[PDB]
């Protein structure tokens, strides 16, 4: 194996929930998305981006109702054209070993559709509509979010801060189901 | 309908005064015990 140096694999294993063997598997998957873009030899730390449009076609992501916003969350400019490091970071957050609070950190931002660092009724309607995959129509989503937003708003300001959100998802773990993706 | 299904479900989990009922599913208990515990708790709330 001459794709990575031993120090690179040490760092990857220490900074993610993957073992070295997993890292080599992830490089193969990354490389297969775009062999003309991705070096087979990473020992000099090349900098390459694979477009979001290719990443969201992987079978592990393509059915996820938040696939674009998940991939964008690990990109510098929010466009989801990931480096290998970004790609590894994202599947480490998504893996079985990652703690709930790490998943929650990314989920809060991905569900904060109007980017004001709280979850309001309207953020929650857009989130639930995607989570329920056409099982619920527009007003059925309203019905649900009406009751959730009051129950979950512990502090009393009409919106959910990150603490409210973490307490919510501890009781209703299905809000994090889209952040459990094995690769 | 589908909204009412989701609603009473999510509302069950998030009620801060009925967390005994909400957390039987988190216990290493057999189904029969979980069901008898929920029946009893629901009487006294
Ligand atoms: Ca918001
Ligand atoms: Ca409707
Ligand atoms: Ca609040």
Q: Per residue, what are the HEC states of A109-176? A: HHCCCCCCCCECHHHHHHHHHHHCCCCCCHHHHHHHHHHHHHHHCCCCCCCECHHHHHHHHHHCHHHH
CA distances from A133 to A112, A163, A181 (A): 19, 27, 17
> Max Cα separation, chain A?
57
Nearest to A144 among B6, B16, B19 (CB): B6
Indicate the resolution in Å.
1.7
Q: Where are the domains of chain B?
A: 2-43
How many residues in total does chain A contain? 183
* Containing structural domain, residue A162: 100-179
Closest partner CB to B7 (pick from A137, A147, A168): A147
Chain B residues with beta carbon closer than 8 angstroms to that of A154:
16
**Residue B30 exposed, middle or buried by CB count within 10 Å (0-12, 13-18, 19+):** exposed
Whether A1 is covered by a domain: the verdict is no
Task: Count the helix, strand and coil residues of chain A and give each as a percent rounded to the nearest 5.
Answer: 55, 0, 45
The residue behind tokens 């290998």 is A84
What is the C-alpha separation between A175 and A169, in angstroms, rounded? 6
Answer whether B10 sits within 8 Å of A143, measured CB to CB: no
Residues contacting A123, CB < 8 A, separation 6+: A111, A112, A113, A114
Q: How many domains does chain A have?
A: 2
**Helix or strand (DSSP H, E) at A32:** helix A20-33
Tokens read off for B33: 């015990």
CATH of the domain at A84: 1.10.238.10
């Amino acid at each position: 194996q001459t794709i990575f140096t031993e120090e690179q694999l040490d760092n990857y294993q220490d900074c993610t929930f993957f073992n070295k063997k997993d890292i080599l598997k992830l490089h193969a998957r990354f490389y297969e998305l775009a062999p003309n873009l991705v070096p087979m030899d990473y020992r000099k730390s090349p900098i390459v981006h694979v477009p979001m449009s290719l990443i969201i076609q992987m079978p592990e992501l393509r059915e996820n109702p938040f696939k674009e916003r998940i991939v964008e969350a690990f990109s510098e400019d929010g466009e989801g054209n990931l480096t290998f490091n970004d790609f590894v970071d994202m599947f480490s957050v998504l893996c079985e070993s990652a703690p709930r609070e790490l998943k929650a950190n990314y989920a809060f931002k991905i569900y904060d559709f109007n980017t004001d660092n709280f979850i309001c009724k309207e953020d929650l309607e857009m989130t639930l509509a995607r989570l329920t995959k056409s099982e619920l129509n527009e007003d059925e989503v309203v019905l649900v979010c009406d009751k959730v937003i009051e129950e979950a708003d512990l502090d009393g300001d009409g919106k959910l801060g990150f603490a409210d959100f973490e307490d919510m998802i501890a009781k209703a773990p299905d809000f994090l189901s889209t952040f459990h993706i094995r690769i | 309908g589908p909204g009412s299904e989701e609603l009473e479900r999510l509302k069950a989990l998030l009620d801060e005064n009925r967390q005994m009922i909400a957390t039987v599913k988190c216990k290493p208990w057999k189904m029969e015990k979980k069901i008898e515990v929920l029946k009893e708790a629901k009487k006294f709330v």
